[PDB]
Curated annotation (Swiss-Prot), chain A:
Outcome after substituting V271A: In strain: Isolate NL
Effect of T57S: In strain: Isolate BE03-40001 and Isolate NL
Organism: Human coronavirus NL63
Name the record gives this protein: Spike glycoprotein
Span within the parent record: 23 to 436 of 1356
Effect ascribed to mutating F280L: In strain: Isolate NL
Post-translational modification: Glycosylated by host with heterogeneous N-linked glycans protruding from the trimer surface. Highly glycosylated by host, occluding many regions across the surface of the protein.
Known outcome of mutating T91S: In strain: Isolate BE03-40001 and Isolate NL
Primary role: S1 region attaches the virion to the cell membrane by interacting with host ACE2, initiating the infection. Binding to the receptor probably induces conformational changes in the S glycoprotein unmasking the fusion peptide and activating membranes fusion. S2 region belongs to the class I viral fusion protein. Under the current model, the protein has at least 3 conformational states: pre-fusion native state, pre-hairpin intermediate state, and post-fusion hairpin state.
Taxonomy, superkingdom: Viruses
UniProtKB/Swiss-Prot annotation, chain B:
Posttranslational modification: Glycosylated by host with heterogeneous N-linked glycans protruding from the trimer surface. Highly glycosylated by host, occluding many regions across the surface of the protein.
First and last residues shown, out of full length: 437 to 485 of 1356
Taxonomic placement: Viruses, Riboviria, Orthornavirae, Pisuviricota, Pisoniviricetes
Name listed for the protein in its UniProt record: Spike glycoprotein
Organism expressing this protein natively: Human coronavirus NL63
Domain of life according to the entry: Viruses
Location of the protein in the cell: Virion membrane; Host endoplasmic reticulum-Golgi intermediate compartment membrane
The protein's role, per its UniProt record: S1 region attaches the virion to the cell membrane by interacting with host ACE2, initiating the infection. Binding to the receptor probably induces conformational changes in the S glycoprotein unmasking the fusion peptide and activating membranes fusion. S2 region belongs to the class I viral fusion protein. Under the current model, the protein has at least 3 conformational states: pre-fusion native state, pre-hairpin intermediate state, and post-fusion hairpin state.
Amino acid sequence: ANLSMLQLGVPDNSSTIVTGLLPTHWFCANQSTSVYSANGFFYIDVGNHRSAFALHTGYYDANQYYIYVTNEIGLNASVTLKICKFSRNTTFDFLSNASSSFDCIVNLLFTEQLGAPLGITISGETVRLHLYNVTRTFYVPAAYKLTKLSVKCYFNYSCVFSVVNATVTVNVTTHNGRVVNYTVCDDCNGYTDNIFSVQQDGRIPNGFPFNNWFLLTNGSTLVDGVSRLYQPLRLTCLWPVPGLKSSTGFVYFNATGSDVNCNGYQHNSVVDVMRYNLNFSANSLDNLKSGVIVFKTLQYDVLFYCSNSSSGVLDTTIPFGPSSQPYYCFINSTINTTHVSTFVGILPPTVREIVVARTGQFYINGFKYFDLGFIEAVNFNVTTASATDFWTVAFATFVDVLVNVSATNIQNLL
Amino acid sequence: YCDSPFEKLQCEHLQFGLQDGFYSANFLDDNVLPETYVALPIYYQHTDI
Amino acid sequence: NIYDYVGTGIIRSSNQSLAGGITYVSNSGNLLGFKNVSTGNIFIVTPC
Ligand SMILES: *[C@@H]1O[C@H](CO)[C@@H](O[C@@H]2O[C@H](CO)[C@@H](O[C@@H]3O[C@H](CO[C@H]4O[C@H](CO)[C@@H](O)[C@H](O)[C@@H]4O[C@@H]4O[C@H](CO)[C@@H](O[C@@H]5O[C@H](CO)[C@H](O)[C@H](O)[C@H]5O)[C@H](O)[C@H]4NC(C)=O)[C@@H](O)[C@H](O[C@H]4O[C@H](CO)[C@@H](O)[C@H](O)[C@@H]4O[C@@H]4O[C@H](CO)[C@@H](O[C@@H]5O[C@H](CO)[C@H](O)[C@H](O)[C@H]5O)[C@H](O)[C@H]4NC(C)=O)[C@@H]3O)[C@H](O)[C@H]2NC(C)=O)[C@H](O)[C@H]1NC(C)=O
Ligand SMILES: *[C@@H]1O[C@H](CO)[C@@H](O[C@@H]2O[C@H](CO)[C@@H](O[C@@H]3O[C@H](CO[C@H]4O[C@H](CO)[C@@H](O)[C@H](O)[C@@H]4O[C@H]4O[C@H](CO)[C@@H](O)[C@H](O)[C@@H]4O)[C@@H](O)[C@H](O[C@H]4O[C@H](CO)[C@@H](O)[C@H](O[C@H]5O[C@H](CO)[C@@H](O)[C@H](O)[C@@H]5O)[C@@H]4O[C@H]4O[C@H](CO)[C@@H](O)[C@H](O)[C@@H]4O[C@H]4O[C@H](CO)[C@@H](O)[C@H](O)[C@@H]4O)[C@@H]3O)[C@H](O)[C@H]2NC(C)=O)[C@H](O)[C@H]1NC(C)=O
Ligand SMILES: *[C@@H]1O[C@H](CO)[C@@H](O[C@@H]2O[C@H](CO)[C@@H](O[C@@H]3O[C@H](CO[C@H]4O[C@H](CO)[C@@H](O)[C@H](O)[C@@H]4O)[C@@H](O)[C@H](O[C@H]4O[C@H](CO[C@H]5O[C@H](CO)[C@@H](O)[C@H](O)[C@@H]5O)[C@@H](O)[C@H](O[C@H]5O[C@H](CO)[C@@H](O)[C@H](O)[C@@H]5O)[C@@H]4O)[C@@H]3O)[C@H](O)[C@H]2NC(C)=O)[C@H](O)[C@H]1NC(C)=O
Ligand SMILES: *[C@@H]1O[C@H](CO)[C@@H](O[C@@H]2O[C@H](CO)[C@@H](O[C@@H]3O[C@H](CO[C@H]4O[C@H](CO)[C@@H](O)[C@H](O)[C@@H]4O)[C@@H](O)[C@H](O[C@H]4O[C@H](CO[C@H]5O[C@H](CO)[C@@H](O)[C@H](O)[C@@H]5O)[C@@H](O)[C@H](O[C@H]5O[C@H](CO)[C@@H](O)[C@H](O)[C@@H]5O)[C@@H]4O)[C@@H]3O)[C@H](O)[C@H]2NC(C)=O)[C@H](O)[C@H]1NC(C)=O
Ligand SMILES: *[C@@H]1O[C@H](CO)[C@@H](O[C@@H]2O[C@H](CO)[C@@H](O[C@@H]3O[C@H](CO[C@H]4O[C@H](CO)[C@@H](O)[C@H](O)[C@@H]4O)[C@@H](O)[C@H](O[C@H]4O[C@H](CO[C@H]5O[C@H](CO)[C@@H](O)[C@H](O)[C@@H]5O)[C@@H](O)[C@H](O[C@H]5O[C@H](CO)[C@@H](O)[C@H](O)[C@@H]5O)[C@@H]4O)[C@@H]3O)[C@H](O)[C@H]2NC(C)=O)[C@H](O)[C@H]1NC(C)=O
Ligand SMILES: *[C@@H]1O[C@H](CO)[C@@H](O[C@@H]2O[C@H](CO)[C@@H](O[C@@H]3O[C@H](CO[C@H]4O[C@H](CO[C@H]5O[C@H](CO)[C@@H](O)[C@H](O)[C@@H]5O)[C@@H](O)[C@H](O[C@H]5O[C@H](CO)[C@@H](O)[C@H](O)[C@@H]5O)[C@@H]4O)[C@@H](O)[C@H](O[C@H]4O[C@H](CO)[C@@H](O)[C@H](O)[C@@H]4O)[C@@H]3O)[C@H](O)[C@H]2NC(C)=O)[C@H](O)[C@H]1NC(C)=O
Ligand SMILES: *[C@@H]1O[C@H](CO)[C@@H](O[C@@H]2O[C@H](CO)[C@@H](O[C@@H]3O[C@H](CO[C@H]4O[C@H](CO)[C@@H](O)[C@H](O)[C@@H]4O)[C@@H](O)[C@H](O[C@H]4O[C@H](CO)[C@@H](O)[C@H](O)[C@@H]4O)[C@@H]3O)[C@H](O)[C@H]2NC(C)=O)[C@H](O)[C@H]1NC(C)=O
């Protein structure tokens, strides 16, 4: 859809990479009946006729919620959304199929500007609602079964509608408050699970499957259940596909340099963490990168490297993804020509995320290993023949949230 | 002696002779059992003291 | 001793289609079934 900025979340005079459930292709049909399989729909109505859409499963159930939207003819857009159970029911019809509504989460009436498309999308047990100026959200149970979609409108009455399968990645350009272009990557593989666009106020967009975003902890590890927490999940910038090289330099905990290309909104403040993200393949032939990590403390630098032998003298490597044998890691430092080394620990079986706080702490896979005094900048010196090592580099700050943890992962966020 | 199936009810209820009615019974047995251990993935490293 | 749960019982294999957590406890702190993480099979734990 060639729709409003806020319905997509893009600022003025920019070009972002938006991912998620988005509409691509319009239809022009008059068969008056066709059962589809989908997860959402967009439409535009300006004609003087009755139009209605509805989402349902494949069989009747007395303990199921059925979405139902009906437009009505007027001077503005008269919309009637109804989400609740139904008794003995209907075949199909416009204008209020059946008044069997007895326990309804939402039952409203909209009067918005004519000439603006609407839309409803489903992700998990979350139902979104775009309204061309606001984005509402309701939590209806057992809403992942609503797969089919029964659309009924006619082309001659100035009625065209799109429909969504899943997870399309786009490239939207804005100018003077209006979207200019809208193109879909046939290329750009894998972008749907690691790239997004930062919304207003530095939030994280809904419906994002958290791929390698771990829960930071100082002690034990959570396994299951809803748990209120206090985690760094409010971004101030995002650097998609950074392509760090061996001749870049330091990075100074603020996105106001010359190489940073933030995505979406971009504020200016001082941050507390720097969440890295590792790109690895299933094969283990070139997942063995040779390099070190150089910190910058107020007094002396600290060098971090790992090896596969107890005496860490003959090797310097950092594995990505799955491995096959234990690896040991060390720390190096110098105080008046006195090289000091110590043993820190053993990497987990799979290294996927690295987080460096600003007050000294250093986490791997959300587990503290050591602790410096004060860090100013980090130089991730990795020797590579291309620009393919990392997905994103995100800065964040601590914010109180509410998390739905399952299998040591993140499902939702509030 | 607590050996007979009825001599165990008295031996469990601490009573010489029992009334008429319904009684609850669940005879355990002390023995030795094998042990199982399942934990989140981690590598193996040992030491002896 | 399964994910920091201790007790006694018999562990049998089964095949159910469930996606989500790797530990199903009752509302009294006792285990009822876990799941091997590197596959999809689950297991059942009952007292003997
Ligand atoms: C996002 O986040 C970013 C990260 O923070 C941030 O960018 C960085 O912000 C920093 C914070 O402000 C900022 O740091 C400041 O930098 C100032 C720049 O001074 C240097 O450049 C000028 C020219 O522009 C130059 O004249 C000056 O001498 C400095 O040159 C440095 O000299 C060093 C040696 O003396 C040299 O070190 C060696 O260099 C070698 C190569 O030549 C070799 O590489 C060696 O290995 C290396 O060790 C160093 O490389 C070089 N730097 C550069 C860039 O060339 C600093 O001046 C400033 O310090 C002063 O201010 C702070 C408060 O702000 C005071 O607390 C501090 O004490 C300093 O005060 C005095 O400053 C003078 C110099 O101005 C010192 O020397 C005096 O010099 C006089 C003549 O110039 C005279 O001779 C006096 O007698 C001398 O004493 C004096 O000692 C200081 N102390 C006192 C008590 O007087 C501060 O460090 C940094 O520059 C930013 N950029 C980076 C890091 O790239 C960014 O801003 C953030 N974004 C946003 C939007 O905010
Ligand atoms: C595992 O365990 C370890 C155990 O250590 C944990 O590590 C600890 O982590 C915590 C969490 O960060 C560290 O605690 C502090 O966090 C502060 C965050 O500031 C927030 O939150 C606090 C909490 O309430 C608020 O009081 C603040 O006002 C601020 O609020 C935010 O939200 C507001 C909402 O409206 C906004 O308005 C605010 O603007 C803000 O966004 C940090 O600030 C603390 O850092 C301070 O100390 C540093 C070293 O001394 C300073 O360098 C630093 O200054 C920063 O900011 C200035 C601003 O210009 C920059 O210029 C600097 O360069 C630097 O970036 C902070 O300085 C404060 O403290 C000093 C010393 O007291 C004061 O002199 C300053 O004036 C400043 O003010 C604060 O103190 C004064 C009293 O003096 C108060 O009046 C004032 O309100 C401020 O509170 C610090 O990080 C804690 O330190 C960590 N532990 C250790 C040992 O370091 C891990 O987190 C655990 N892991 C997990 C996963 O849980
Ligand atoms: C994409 O999604 C959208 C949903 O958002 C789908 O609907 C399309 O929505 C577009 C707007 O976002 C529509 O584009 C406009 O089309 C207007 C058509 O108006 C004429 O036709 C209607 C009947 O259909 C009639 O009532 C009306 O009176 C007109 O005759 C265009 O008017 C408009 O562009 C025109 O106006 C702009 C600026 O005009 C403003 O300023 C004038 C003073 O200068 C003032 O008098 C005006 O009133 C107005 O305030 C002008 O710059 C345009 O110039 C074009 O041409 C020059 C070359 O001469 C070119 O250089 C320039 O770049 C422009 O291209 C032009 O004169 C809008 O373009 C679109 O019509 C909607 N589509 C349909 C079918 O309704 C859309 O379908 C989706 N598309 C796809 C492919 O999926
Ligand atoms: C999907 O498509 C449309 C979506 O709207 C569905 O309805 C059709 O809509 C069309 C467009 O509105 C209709 O075509 C004309 O409709 C006019 C009615 O106007 C209404 O709407 C206007 C607003 O636009 C409104 O202001 C007005 O008050 C009405 O409400 C008709 O008047 C018009 O008739 C014209 O043409 C006839 C001749 O046409 C016949 O004969 C042709 C061969 O000569 C033949 O090819 C044609 O197919 C047709 O059979 C002409 O005689 C009329 O002029 C008479 O009246 C003037 C005075 O006004 C008098 O001076 C003159 O001497 C004549 O006596 C007039 O110029 C058009 O029919 C279309 O009719 C709608 N369809 C139907 C069935 O009614 C459509 O139904 C949908 N599709 C399906 C399959 O359902
Ligand atoms: C995306 O791009 C579009 C365009 O493609 C942007 O839309 C327009 O963007 C223009 C500038 O990019 C805007 O022009 C500005 O006009 C302001 C005056 O508007 C006042 O009055 C209106 C009512 O008429 C009111 O609504 C509004 O709120 C204002 O009160 C000017 O303020 C502005 O710049 C002026 O000031 C700068 C100095 O700015 C510095 O100082 C400020 C404190 O005074 C400080 O706050 C700033 O941060 C900054 O540090 C001055 O240099 C400008 O001088 C111009 O003119 C001289 C000639 O005299 C020329 O030599 C120089 O090069 C400058 O061109 C100027 O006096 C702007 O001029 C326009 O309003 C926008 N239109 C719309 C409809 O929005 C859009 O903004 C872009 N998106 C984003 C997010 O920015
Ligand atoms: C996360 O990591 C994963 C890890 O796999 C990564 O996935 C791969 O991503 C790449 C995209 O970069 C996918 O596409 C492949 O691209 C190959 C490119 O071939 C061209 O370049 C070759 C060398 O270029 C490198 O080196 C030069 C310096 O020499 C450097 O400047 C470049 O920037 C670049 O780094 C070059 O060899 C090749 O042809 C040269 O040689 C011939 C002579 O033989 C000469 O005549 C030419 O003029 C030219 O000089 C070409 O120009 C491409 O080859 C490759 O094709 C293979 O795979 C496909 C698909 O399997 C097969 O169909 C095909 O037959 C080849 O076997 C492929 O297209 C790549 O597919 C991904 N890998 C997998 C497994 O999917 C992600 O991208 C990473 N994510 C992020 C965000 O970075
Ligand atoms: C108005 O209100 C209704 C509910 O009140 C909303 O949703 C409908 O909900 C009912 C159940 O409450 C759904 O009923 C279903 O009917 C199917 C019939 O489908 C017809 O059409 C298809 C293709 O269009 C044909 O293939 C089919 O033969 C029918 O002609 C039944 O198939 C369902 O149950 C039967 O099939 C299942 C297998 O799927 C069996 O297991 C069952 O035992 C049973 O035999 C089911 O009962 C209905 O589909 C929903 N939609 C509609 C449009 O009615 C409406 O959305 C709401 N709004 C509108 C505009 O109607």
